[PDB]
Structure 1
Amino acid sequence: TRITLPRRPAKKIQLGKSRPAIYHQFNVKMELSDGSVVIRRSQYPKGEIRLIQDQRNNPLWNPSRGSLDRFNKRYSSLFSTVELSEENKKKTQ
């Protein structure tokens, strides 16, 4: 019933011979929402990443400062604000 991986005999690490787990890590450059780059050590092999949604473009972190895309594409000739004002009578609710 319980799904498991059944254990083999464990390998005897002798006292003194235990070595610390130094995992393989690459120096990875993260460019945030704006052009601020930051280096971080990372286990996945990718020298450069650029981020879209970060603290540097979130309103909570700076208060002082593709369905939608598809819709935009196929209702482009009409150009869909003025449109909002036209189609927003707040009597009926």
Structure 2
Amino acid sequence: TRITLPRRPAKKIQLGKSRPAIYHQFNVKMELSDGSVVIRRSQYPKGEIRLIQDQRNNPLWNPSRG
């Protein structure tokens, strides 16, 4: 009834030999709604993204300004 992935025997990480999970990350440029670019580290492979709906074009974040 319960859908599962049945476990194999676990691999023994010895004490001292445990290594920290450094995932593969690319430096990704986000251009926001306006031309303000910001670099962020990201796991998905895409060097550049440009955003349509951000805080920089939302009325809540700037009240004064198919």
Fold in common (TM above 0.5): yes
Provide, for residues 35-59 of structure 1, a one-character-per-residue CA deviation record: whole Å limited to 9, x for no partner: 0000000000000000000000000
CA RMSD, 1 decimal: 0.0
TM-score normalized with structure 1 length = 0.71
Bigger radius of gyration? 1
- Structure 2, unmatched stretches of 5+, are none
Percent identical residues: 100
Provide, for residues 5-62 of structure 1, a one-character-per-residue CA deviation record: whole Å limited to 9, x for no partner: 0000000000000000000000000000000000000000000000000000000000
TM-score normalized with structure 2 length = 1.00
Report how many residues are paired: 66
Aligned partner of residue 56 in structure 2, secondary structure: helix
Aligned partner of residue 59 in structure 1, secondary structure: coil
Q: Would you identify which runs of 4 or more consecutive aligned residues in structure 1 move more than 4 Å? A: none
Higher strand proportion? 2
Higher helix proportion? 1
